[PDB]
Design an enzyme around this catalytic site. Structure first.
Site, PDB file in Angstrom:
ATOM      1  N   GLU A 146       8.191  18.228  42.735  1.00 26.84           N
ATOM      2  CA  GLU A 146       8.043  17.251  43.803  1.00 26.84           C
ATOM      3  C   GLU A 146       6.598  16.830  44.040  1.00 26.84           C
ATOM      4  O   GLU A 146       6.323  15.648  44.234  1.00 26.84           O
ATOM      5  CB  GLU A 146       8.642  17.788  45.104  1.00 26.84           C
ATOM      6  CG  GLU A 146      10.147  18.013  45.057  1.00 26.84           C
ATOM      7  CD  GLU A 146      10.893  16.879  44.373  1.00 26.84           C
ATOM      8  OE1 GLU A 146      10.601  15.696  44.657  1.00 26.84           O
ATOM      9  OE2 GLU A 146      11.781  17.169  43.550  1.00 26.84           O
TER      10      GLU A 146
ATOM     11  N   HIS B 126       5.363  14.284  41.783  1.00 19.53           N
ATOM     12  CA  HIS B 126       5.786  12.948  42.190  1.00 19.53           C
ATOM     13  C   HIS B 126       4.758  12.240  43.067  1.00 19.53           C
ATOM     14  O   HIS B 126       4.484  11.057  42.861  1.00 19.53           O
ATOM     15  CB  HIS B 126       7.122  13.003  42.941  1.00 19.53           C
ATOM     16  CG  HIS B 126       8.322  12.932  42.053  1.00 19.53           C
ATOM     17  ND1 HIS B 126       8.497  11.936  41.116  1.00 19.53           N
ATOM     18  CD2 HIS B 126       9.424  13.715  41.976  1.00 19.53           C
ATOM     19  CE1 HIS B 126       9.651  12.107  40.502  1.00 19.53           C
ATOM     20  NE2 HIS B 126      10.234  13.181  41.005  1.00 19.53           N
TER      21      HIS B 126
HETATM   22 FE   LIG Z   1      12.210  13.984  40.058  1.00 18.34          FE
END
Ligand SMILES: [Fe+3]
Ligand code: NA
Length: 183
Positions: free
Chosen positions: A154, A157
């Site tokens: 995450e 990201h």
């Molecule tokens: Fe992803």
């Protein structure tokens, strides 16, 4: 009371440039727009993991989500790892990590990429993450294995990094000595 519901169509797909941008640091104290977005991201993960709900709401199961996947370039991520880590993290940041490495033997999923991508993604087995919750409280937690991998996926990201960027296309399952494979 009111709130929006994240639908599979709100989740952008690989190819959308927003996924490659370094997300923006959010301001404190948290706005309500940011607090609501978090609750929305967390309601999604939980709903996607409930058979009845996921089915009726036509949702694909997930354990983590990042704002950029919703086309919102902000450093906000949510995780609901099924036992147990369930929280929204504002401005998350990894402070330290273990030497020991690990990876998901089944490979990492990503609601944003529809194609299947073979290989192993090597990550830090253990990490220490610092972030702010919806109440403004600051936290520093030590994570490991699956949860460490999820958070790492995450945070990548919010820095514009996709999981396959870590996969050597010609040597997809390359693993150094001692990598722990979780599965
Ligand atoms: Fe992803
Ligand atoms: Na939205």
């Amino acid at each position: 009371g009111s709130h929006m519901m994240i639908t599979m169509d709100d989740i952008i797909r690989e190819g959308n440039p927003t996924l490659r941008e370094v997300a923006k640091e959010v301001s404190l104290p948290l706005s309500e727009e940011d607090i609501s977005l978090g609750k929305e991201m967390l309601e999604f993960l939980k709903n996607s993991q409930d058979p009845i709900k996921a089915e009726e709401l036509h949702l694909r199961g997930g354990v983590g989500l990042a704002a950029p996947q919703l086309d919102i370039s902000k450093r906000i991520i949510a995780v609901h790892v099924p036992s147990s880590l369930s929280t929204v993290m504002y401005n998350p940041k990894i402070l330290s990590h273990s030497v020991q490495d690990a990876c998901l033997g089944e490979g990492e999923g990503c609601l944003s990429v529809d194609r299947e991508v073979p290989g192993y993604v090597v990550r830090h087995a253990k990490i220490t993450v610092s972030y702010y919750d919806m109440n403004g409280e600051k936290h520093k937690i030590r994570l490991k294995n699956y949860e460490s991998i999820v958070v790492q996926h995450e945070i990548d990201h919010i820095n514009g990094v996709m999981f396959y960027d870590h996969i050597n296309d010609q040597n997809p399952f390359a693993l150094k000595e001692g990598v722990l494979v979780i599965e």
